Amino acid sequence: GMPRGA
Amino acid sequence: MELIRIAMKKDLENDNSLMNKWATVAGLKNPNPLYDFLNHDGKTFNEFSSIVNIVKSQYPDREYELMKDYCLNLDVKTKAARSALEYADANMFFEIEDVLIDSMISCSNMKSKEYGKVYKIHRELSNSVITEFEAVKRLGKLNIKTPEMNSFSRLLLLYHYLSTGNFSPMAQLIKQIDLSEISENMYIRNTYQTRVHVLMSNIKLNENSLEECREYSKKALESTNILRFQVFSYLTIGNSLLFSNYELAQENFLKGLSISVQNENYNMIFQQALCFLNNVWRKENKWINFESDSIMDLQEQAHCFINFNENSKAKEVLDKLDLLVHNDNELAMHYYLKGRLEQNKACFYSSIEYFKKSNDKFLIRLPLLELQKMGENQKLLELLLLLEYA
């Protein structure tokens, strides 16, 4: 998948 | 003495102009708190901003070692210790953070007690030690009084939503935050503000509002000197370009790589971002992790295999993924891959269902495009774009 973060 | 002030004094023995330069870097206006900070044990600056800025300017290569020693020797009842808890959490310095937390949960100052108990809920929820239900319940019983922990009780939910692929509650929750209510601790206010800028970038990305997503990440970058927030800004900017600008998306992920080379976790995240980028554009993919059984990495093995018409090897990998447990956003991606392998429209509708469930308006462009290629009625696609989930 696509990595996502904050 | 703490290692930080030992080094600051031995370095001021050799150069005296460092007094005026350190006072400017810390924002002090005159070295009076600097002199006091070096001459009596236990004296703290008014804003944690002061020590962090000197450490980053004068000893950048030694930040972690210096701040670990300085933070863990602070009076847990103080403002300085409460700022260090945020510094630690914002930097993902978990070993500083968890020591400070069990230390502040134990003390006798009520502000530090509160911070500790709320940051502990965030850490337990972060590690899937507790569910969201037991976190919300525990937060309620705390009767949180400070505006900082009222802001952070909501931030920690936002991070949990982002990480579990459950995006629909985030927009209304983030609107409840008012950081102008934070007036006692300018370092916590400024760092929470960076936190909100990066979370707003992710929410705008998840709404397919790509210009606004990039403006919010750019404001995070101008607002911060903390590596964790720069990493997630470059990550989110790059993600926003995935479907439109290969070279600029790659350039942002490579900039992210360049600033996180000594951090295995952040380095891995940019490899994964470059891995997805190259699969979206159906190019040769040198970023695949063939020694992993995470869903993220396995999905990209399958994607690349499908792109290069190696359908057997993609079937093997997708056989693996069936025997792992997916969340909503991961499942939507799983059905997208199944549809591309199978050439099966039903897989693409299940993909859409779960992007709708997760409220992901960005990655849904993948199954939508495949349906269009297979001749789906344009009016139907418009309708799917328009309807939403409960």
CSV table of C-alpha atoms in Angstrom, one decimal:
chain,number,residue,atom,x,y,z
A,1,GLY,CA,0.0,0.0,0.0
A,2,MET,CA,0.8,3.7,0.3
A,3,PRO,CA,2.6,4.7,3.6
A,4,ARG,CA,0.9,7.5,5.6
A,5,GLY,CA,2.0,9.3,8.7
A,6,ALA,CA,1.9,12.4,10.8
B,1,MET,CA,26.5,18.3,36.2
B,2,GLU,CA,24.5,17.4,33.1
B,3,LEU,CA,26.5,16.5,30.0
B,4,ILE,CA,24.9,19.4,28.1
B,5,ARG,CA,26.3,22.1,30.4
B,6,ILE,CA,29.7,20.4,30.9
B,7,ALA,CA,30.1,20.6,27.1
B,8,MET,CA,28.7,24.2,27.0
B,9,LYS,CA,31.2,25.4,29.5
B,10,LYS,CA,34.3,23.7,28.2
B,11,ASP,CA,33.4,25.2,24.8
B,12,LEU,CA,32.9,28.7,26.3
B,13,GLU,CA,36.4,28.4,28.0
B,14,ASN,CA,37.8,28.3,24.4
B,15,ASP,CA,35.5,31.0,22.8
B,16,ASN,CA,33.7,33.8,24.7
B,17,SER,CA,31.6,35.1,21.8
B,18,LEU,CA,29.5,31.9,22.1
B,19,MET,CA,27.7,33.8,24.9
B,20,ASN,CA,26.0,36.3,22.6
B,21,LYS,CA,25.4,33.7,19.9
B,22,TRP,CA,23.7,31.2,22.3
B,23,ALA,CA,21.6,34.0,23.7
B,24,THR,CA,20.3,34.9,20.3
B,25,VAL,CA,19.7,31.2,19.3
B,26,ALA,CA,17.7,30.6,22.4
B,27,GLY,CA,15.8,33.8,21.8
B,28,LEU,CA,16.9,35.2,25.2
B,29,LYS,CA,17.7,38.9,24.2
B,30,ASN,CA,20.4,38.9,26.9
B,31,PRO,CA,22.6,36.1,28.4
B,32,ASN,CA,21.2,36.5,32.0
B,33,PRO,CA,19.2,33.2,31.9
B,34,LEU,CA,22.1,31.6,30.1
B,35,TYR,CA,24.6,32.5,32.9
B,36,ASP,CA,22.1,31.3,35.5
B,37,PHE,CA,21.6,28.1,33.5
B,38,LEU,CA,25.3,27.3,33.6
B,39,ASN,CA,26.0,28.2,37.3
B,40,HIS,CA,23.3,26.6,39.5
B,41,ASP,CA,22.1,23.1,39.2
B,42,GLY,CA,18.4,22.7,38.6
B,43,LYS,CA,17.8,26.1,36.9
B,44,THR,CA,15.5,25.9,33.8
B,45,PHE,CA,14.8,28.2,31.0
B,46,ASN,CA,11.4,29.8,30.6
B,47,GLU,CA,10.8,28.0,27.3
B,48,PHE,CA,12.2,24.5,26.5
B,49,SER,CA,12.7,26.2,23.1
B,50,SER,CA,15.8,27.7,24.5
B,51,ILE,CA,17.8,24.5,25.3
B,52,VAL,CA,16.6,22.6,22.2
B,53,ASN,CA,17.7,25.4,19.9
B,54,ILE,CA,21.2,25.6,21.4
B,55,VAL,CA,21.6,21.8,21.2
B,56,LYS,CA,20.5,21.9,17.6
B,57,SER,CA,22.8,24.8,16.7
B,58,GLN,CA,26.0,23.9,18.6
B,59,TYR,CA,25.9,20.1,18.9
B,60,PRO,CA,23.5,18.8,16.2
B,61,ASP,CA,25.3,15.5,16.0
B,62,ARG,CA,24.8,14.9,19.7
B,63,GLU,CA,21.2,15.9,20.2
B,64,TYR,CA,19.7,12.6,21.4
B,65,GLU,CA,22.6,11.8,23.8
B,66,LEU,CA,22.5,15.4,25.2
B,67,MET,CA,18.7,15.7,25.6
B,68,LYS,CA,18.3,12.2,27.0
B,69,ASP,CA,20.7,13.1,29.8
B,70,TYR,CA,19.2,16.5,30.3
B,71,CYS,CA,15.6,15.4,30.2
B,72,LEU,CA,15.9,12.4,32.5
B,73,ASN,CA,17.6,14.6,35.2
B,74,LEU,CA,14.8,17.2,35.3
B,75,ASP,CA,12.4,17.8,38.2
B,76,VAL,CA,9.4,15.9,37.0
B,77,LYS,CA,7.1,18.4,38.8
B,78,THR,CA,8.3,21.3,36.6
B,79,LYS,CA,7.3,23.0,33.4
B,80,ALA,CA,10.6,22.0,31.9
B,81,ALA,CA,9.7,18.3,32.5
B,82,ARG,CA,6.3,18.7,30.9
B,83,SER,CA,7.9,20.3,27.8
B,84,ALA,CA,10.5,17.5,27.7
B,85,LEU,CA,7.6,15.0,27.6
B,86,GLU,CA,6.3,16.7,24.5
B,87,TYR,CA,9.8,17.0,23.0
B,88,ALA,CA,10.3,13.3,23.6
B,89,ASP,CA,6.9,12.3,22.2
B,90,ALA,CA,7.1,14.5,19.1
B,91,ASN,CA,10.6,13.1,18.3
B,92,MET,CA,9.5,9.5,19.0
B,93,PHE,CA,12.2,9.3,21.6
B,94,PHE,CA,10.1,6.5,23.3
B,95,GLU,CA,12.7,5.6,25.9
B,96,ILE,CA,12.9,9.2,27.2
B,97,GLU,CA,9.1,9.5,27.0
B,98,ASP,CA,8.2,6.3,28.8
B,99,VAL,CA,10.6,7.0,31.7
B,100,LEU,CA,9.2,10.6,32.0
B,101,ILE,CA,5.6,9.2,31.9
B,102,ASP,CA,5.8,6.6,34.7
B,103,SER,CA,7.7,9.3,36.6
B,104,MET,CA,5.1,12.0,36.2
B,105,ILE,CA,2.2,9.6,36.9
B,106,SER,CA,3.9,9.1,40.3
B,107,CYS,CA,4.7,12.6,41.4
B,108,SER,CA,2.7,15.1,43.4
B,109,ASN,CA,2.2,18.0,40.9
B,110,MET,CA,-1.2,17.9,39.4
B,111,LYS,CA,-0.3,19.4,36.0
B,112,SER,CA,2.5,16.9,35.5
B,113,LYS,CA,0.2,14.1,36.8
B,114,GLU,CA,-2.3,15.0,34.0
B,115,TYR,CA,0.2,15.2,31.1
B,116,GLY,CA,1.7,11.8,32.2
B,117,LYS,CA,-1.7,10.1,32.4
B,118,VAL,CA,-2.8,11.4,29.0
B,119,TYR,CA,0.5,10.8,27.2
B,120,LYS,CA,0.3,7.2,28.7
B,121,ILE,CA,-3.1,6.7,27.1
B,122,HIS,CA,-1.6,7.8,23.8
B,123,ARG,CA,1.3,5.4,24.1
B,124,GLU,CA,-1.0,2.4,25.1
B,125,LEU,CA,-3.3,3.2,22.2
B,126,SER,CA,-0.4,3.6,19.9
B,127,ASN,CA,0.8,0.1,20.7
B,128,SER,CA,-2.6,-1.5,20.5
B,129,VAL,CA,-2.4,-2.2,24.3
B,130,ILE,CA,-5.9,-0.7,24.7
B,131,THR,CA,-8.8,-0.2,22.3
B,132,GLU,CA,-10.1,3.2,21.3
B,133,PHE,CA,-13.2,2.6,23.5
B,134,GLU,CA,-11.1,2.1,26.6
B,135,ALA,CA,-8.9,5.1,25.7
B,136,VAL,CA,-12.0,7.4,25.4
B,137,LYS,CA,-13.4,6.1,28.6
B,138,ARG,CA,-10.1,6.6,30.5
B,139,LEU,CA,-9.7,10.1,29.0
B,140,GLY,CA,-13.2,10.9,30.3
B,141,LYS,CA,-12.5,9.8,33.8
B,142,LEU,CA,-9.5,12.1,34.0
B,143,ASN,CA,-11.6,15.3,33.9
B,144,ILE,CA,-8.9,17.0,31.9
B,145,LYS,CA,-8.4,20.6,33.0
B,146,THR,CA,-5.4,22.0,31.1
B,147,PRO,CA,-6.0,23.3,27.6
B,148,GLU,CA,-2.8,21.5,26.4
B,149,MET,CA,-4.1,18.1,27.4
B,150,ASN,CA,-7.6,18.9,26.1
B,151,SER,CA,-5.8,19.6,22.8
B,152,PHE,CA,-3.7,16.4,23.1
B,153,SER,CA,-6.7,14.2,24.1
B,154,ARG,CA,-7.9,14.9,20.6
B,155,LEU,CA,-4.6,14.7,18.8
B,156,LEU,CA,-4.0,11.2,20.1
B,157,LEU,CA,-7.4,10.1,18.7
B,158,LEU,CA,-6.5,11.7,15.4
B,159,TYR,CA,-3.2,9.7,15.2
B,160,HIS,CA,-5.1,6.5,16.0
B,161,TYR,CA,-7.7,7.2,13.2
B,162,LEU,CA,-4.9,7.9,10.7
B,163,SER,CA,-3.0,4.7,11.5
B,164,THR,CA,-6.1,2.4,11.4
B,165,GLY,CA,-7.4,3.7,8.1
B,166,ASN,CA,-10.5,5.2,9.6
B,167,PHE,CA,-10.5,8.7,8.1
B,168,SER,CA,-14.2,9.8,8.3
B,169,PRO,CA,-14.1,11.1,12.0
B,170,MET,CA,-10.9,13.2,11.5
B,171,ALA,CA,-12.2,16.4,9.9
B,172,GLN,CA,-14.8,17.2,12.5
B,173,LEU,CA,-12.5,16.2,15.4
B,174,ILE,CA,-9.6,18.3,14.3
B,175,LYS,CA,-11.9,21.3,14.1
B,176,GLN,CA,-12.5,21.0,17.9
B,177,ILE,CA,-8.9,21.9,18.6
B,178,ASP,CA,-8.1,25.5,19.6
B,179,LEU,CA,-4.4,26.0,20.3
B,180,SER,CA,-5.0,29.7,21.0
B,181,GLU,CA,-6.2,28.5,24.5
B,182,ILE,CA,-2.6,27.4,25.2
B,183,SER,CA,-0.9,30.4,26.8
B,184,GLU,CA,1.3,29.0,29.5
B,185,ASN,CA,3.7,26.9,27.4
B,186,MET,CA,4.8,28.4,24.1
B,187,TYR,CA,6.9,25.3,23.2
B,188,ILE,CA,3.9,23.0,23.6
B,189,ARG,CA,1.7,25.4,21.6
B,190,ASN,CA,4.2,25.7,18.8
B,191,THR,CA,4.8,22.0,18.5
B,192,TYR,CA,1.1,21.1,18.7
B,193,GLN,CA,0.7,23.6,15.9
B,194,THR,CA,3.1,21.7,13.8
B,195,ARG,CA,1.2,18.5,14.7
B,196,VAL,CA,-2.0,20.0,13.5
B,197,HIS,CA,-0.4,21.3,10.3
B,198,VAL,CA,0.7,17.7,9.4
B,199,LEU,CA,-2.5,16.1,10.4
B,200,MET,CA,-4.4,18.7,8.3
B,201,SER,CA,-2.1,17.8,5.4
B,202,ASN,CA,-3.1,14.2,5.7
B,203,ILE,CA,-6.8,15.0,6.0
B,204,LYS,CA,-6.8,17.2,2.9
B,205,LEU,CA,-4.9,14.4,1.0
B,206,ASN,CA,-7.6,11.9,2.2
B,207,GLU,CA,-10.2,14.3,0.8
B,208,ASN,CA,-8.5,14.5,-2.6
B,209,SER,CA,-7.8,18.2,-1.9
B,210,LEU,CA,-4.3,18.2,-3.2
B,211,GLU,CA,-3.3,21.8,-3.4
B,212,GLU,CA,-4.5,22.4,0.2
B,213,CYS,CA,-2.7,19.3,1.3
B,214,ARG,CA,0.6,20.6,0.0
B,215,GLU,CA,0.1,24.1,1.5
B,216,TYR,CA,-0.4,22.6,4.9
B,217,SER,CA,2.7,20.4,4.7
B,218,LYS,CA,4.7,23.4,3.5
B,219,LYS,CA,3.5,25.4,6.6
B,220,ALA,CA,4.5,22.5,8.8
B,221,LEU,CA,8.0,22.6,7.3
B,222,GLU,CA,8.4,26.4,7.9
B,223,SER,CA,7.1,25.9,11.4
B,224,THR,CA,9.5,23.2,12.7
B,225,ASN,CA,13.0,21.9,13.3
B,226,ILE,CA,11.9,18.5,14.5
B,227,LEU,CA,12.9,15.7,12.1
B,228,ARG,CA,9.7,13.6,12.7
B,229,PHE,CA,7.5,16.4,11.4
B,230,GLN,CA,9.7,17.2,8.4
B,231,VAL,CA,9.7,13.5,7.5
B,232,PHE,CA,5.9,13.3,7.5
B,233,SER,CA,5.6,16.6,5.6
B,234,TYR,CA,7.8,15.4,2.7
B,235,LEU,CA,6.0,12.0,2.8
B,236,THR,CA,2.6,13.7,2.5
B,237,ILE,CA,3.7,16.2,-0.2
B,238,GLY,CA,5.1,13.3,-2.2
B,239,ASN,CA,2.0,11.2,-1.8
B,240,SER,CA,-0.1,14.1,-3.0
B,241,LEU,CA,1.8,14.1,-6.4
B,242,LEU,CA,1.5,10.3,-6.9
B,243,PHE,CA,-1.0,10.4,-9.7
B,244,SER,CA,0.3,13.5,-11.5
B,245,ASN,CA,4.0,14.2,-11.2
B,246,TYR,CA,6.3,11.2,-11.0
B,247,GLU,CA,9.5,13.3,-10.9
B,248,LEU,CA,8.4,15.7,-8.2
B,249,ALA,CA,6.9,12.9,-6.1
B,250,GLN,CA,10.2,11.1,-6.3
B,251,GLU,CA,12.1,14.2,-5.6
B,252,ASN,CA,10.2,14.7,-2.3
B,253,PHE,CA,10.6,11.1,-1.2
B,254,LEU,CA,14.3,11.3,-2.0
B,255,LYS,CA,14.5,14.5,0.1
B,256,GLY,CA,12.8,12.5,2.8
B,257,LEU,CA,15.3,9.7,2.4
B,258,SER,CA,18.2,12.2,2.6
B,259,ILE,CA,17.1,13.6,6.0
B,260,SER,CA,16.3,10.3,7.6
B,261,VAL,CA,19.3,8.1,6.6
B,262,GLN,CA,20.4,7.5,10.2
B,263,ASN,CA,16.8,6.5,11.3
B,264,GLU,CA,15.9,3.0,10.2
B,265,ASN,CA,12.1,3.6,10.7
B,266,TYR,CA,11.9,6.8,8.6
B,267,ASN,CA,14.3,5.4,6.0
B,268,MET,CA,12.0,2.4,5.6
B,269,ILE,CA,8.9,4.7,5.2
B,270,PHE,CA,10.5,6.5,2.2
B,271,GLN,CA,11.5,3.2,0.5
B,272,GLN,CA,7.9,2.1,0.9
B,273,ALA,CA,6.7,5.4,-0.6
B,274,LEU,CA,9.1,5.1,-3.5
B,275,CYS,CA,8.0,1.5,-3.9
B,276,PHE,CA,4.3,2.5,-4.2
B,277,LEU,CA,5.1,5.4,-6.5
B,278,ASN,CA,7.0,3.1,-8.9
B,279,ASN,CA,4.1,0.6,-8.9
B,280,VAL,CA,1.5,3.2,-9.6
B,281,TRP,CA,3.5,4.3,-12.6
B,282,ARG,CA,4.1,0.6,-13.6
B,283,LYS,CA,7.9,1.1,-13.7
B,284,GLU,CA,10.8,-1.2,-12.7
B,285,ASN,CA,10.7,-1.2,-9.0
B,286,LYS,CA,14.0,-1.4,-7.1
B,287,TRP,CA,12.4,-0.6,-3.7
B,288,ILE,CA,10.5,-3.8,-3.1
B,289,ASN,CA,11.1,-5.5,0.2
B,290,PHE,CA,11.1,-9.2,-0.5
B,291,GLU,CA,12.0,-10.1,3.1
B,292,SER,CA,8.8,-8.8,4.8
B,293,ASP,CA,5.4,-10.2,5.8
B,294,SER,CA,3.7,-6.9,6.5
B,295,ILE,CA,0.6,-6.2,4.4
B,296,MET,CA,2.1,-2.9,3.1
B,297,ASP,CA,5.2,-4.7,1.7
B,298,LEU,CA,3.4,-7.8,0.5
B,299,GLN,CA,0.8,-5.7,-1.4
B,300,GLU,CA,3.6,-4.0,-3.3
B,301,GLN,CA,5.3,-7.3,-4.3
B,302,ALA,CA,2.0,-8.4,-5.8
B,303,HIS,CA,1.4,-5.0,-7.5
B,304,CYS,CA,4.8,-5.1,-9.2
B,305,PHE,CA,4.3,-8.8,-10.2
B,306,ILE,CA,0.9,-7.9,-11.8
B,307,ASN,CA,2.4,-4.9,-13.6
B,308,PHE,CA,5.0,-7.1,-15.3
B,309,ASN,CA,2.5,-9.9,-16.2
B,310,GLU,CA,4.0,-12.4,-13.8
B,311,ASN,CA,0.6,-13.6,-12.7
B,312,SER,CA,1.8,-16.8,-11.0
B,313,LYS,CA,4.2,-15.0,-8.6
B,314,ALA,CA,1.5,-12.4,-7.9
B,315,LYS,CA,-0.9,-15.3,-7.1
B,316,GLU,CA,1.6,-16.7,-4.6
B,317,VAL,CA,2.0,-13.3,-2.9
B,318,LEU,CA,-1.8,-12.8,-2.9
B,319,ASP,CA,-2.2,-16.3,-1.4
B,320,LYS,CA,0.0,-15.1,1.5
B,321,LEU,CA,-2.1,-11.9,1.9
B,322,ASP,CA,-5.4,-13.9,2.2
B,323,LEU,CA,-3.9,-15.5,5.4
B,324,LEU,CA,-3.3,-12.1,7.0
B,325,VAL,CA,-5.9,-9.9,8.7
B,326,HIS,CA,-6.6,-6.5,6.9
B,327,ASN,CA,-8.2,-3.3,8.1
B,328,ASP,CA,-10.7,-1.3,5.9
B,329,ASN,CA,-8.1,0.8,3.9
B,330,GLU,CA,-5.8,-2.2,3.5
B,331,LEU,CA,-8.7,-4.4,2.3
B,332,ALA,CA,-9.8,-1.8,-0.4
B,333,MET,CA,-6.2,-2.0,-1.7
B,334,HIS,CA,-6.3,-5.8,-1.5
B,335,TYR,CA,-9.4,-5.9,-3.7
B,336,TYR,CA,-7.9,-3.5,-6.2
B,337,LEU,CA,-5.0,-6.0,-6.6
B,338,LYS,CA,-7.3,-8.9,-6.9
B,339,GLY,CA,-9.3,-7.1,-9.6
B,340,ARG,CA,-6.2,-6.3,-11.6
B,341,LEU,CA,-5.0,-9.9,-11.4
B,342,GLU,CA,-8.4,-11.4,-12.1
B,343,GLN,CA,-9.7,-8.7,-14.5
B,344,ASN,CA,-12.8,-8.9,-12.3
B,345,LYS,CA,-15.2,-5.9,-12.0
B,346,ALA,CA,-16.6,-7.2,-8.8
B,347,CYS,CA,-13.3,-6.9,-7.1
B,348,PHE,CA,-13.1,-3.3,-8.1
B,349,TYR,CA,-16.5,-2.6,-6.6
B,350,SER,CA,-15.5,-4.2,-3.3
B,351,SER,CA,-12.4,-2.0,-3.5
B,352,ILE,CA,-14.6,1.1,-3.9
B,353,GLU,CA,-16.9,-0.1,-1.0
B,354,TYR,CA,-14.0,-0.1,1.4
B,355,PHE,CA,-12.3,3.1,0.2
B,356,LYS,CA,-15.8,4.6,0.8
B,357,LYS,CA,-15.9,2.9,4.3
B,358,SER,CA,-12.5,4.2,5.2
B,359,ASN,CA,-13.4,7.6,3.6
B,360,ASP,CA,-10.3,7.6,1.4
B,361,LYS,CA,-11.1,9.8,-1.6
B,362,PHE,CA,-7.5,9.6,-2.9
B,363,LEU,CA,-6.6,6.0,-3.4
B,364,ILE,CA,-10.1,5.3,-4.7
B,365,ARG,CA,-8.9,6.8,-8.0
B,366,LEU,CA,-7.1,3.5,-8.6
B,367,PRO,CA,-10.1,1.1,-8.9
B,368,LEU,CA,-12.2,3.9,-10.5
B,369,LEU,CA,-9.6,4.2,-13.3
B,370,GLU,CA,-9.6,0.5,-13.9
B,371,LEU,CA,-13.4,0.4,-14.2
B,372,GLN,CA,-13.2,3.2,-16.7
B,373,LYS,CA,-10.6,1.2,-18.8
B,374,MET,CA,-13.0,-1.7,-18.8
B,375,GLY,CA,-15.8,0.5,-20.2
B,376,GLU,CA,-17.8,1.3,-17.2
B,377,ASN,CA,-20.6,3.9,-17.9
B,378,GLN,CA,-19.4,7.4,-17.2
B,379,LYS,CA,-22.6,8.3,-15.4
B,380,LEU,CA,-22.2,5.3,-13.0
B,381,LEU,CA,-18.6,6.4,-12.2
B,382,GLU,CA,-19.9,9.9,-11.4
B,383,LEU,CA,-22.5,8.4,-9.2
B,384,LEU,CA,-20.0,6.3,-7.3
B,385,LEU,CA,-17.8,9.4,-6.9
B,386,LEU,CA,-20.9,11.3,-5.5
B,387,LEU,CA,-22.4,8.8,-3.0
B,388,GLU,CA,-20.8,8.1,0.3
B,389,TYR,CA,-20.9,5.6,3.2
B,390,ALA,CA,-23.1,5.9,6.3
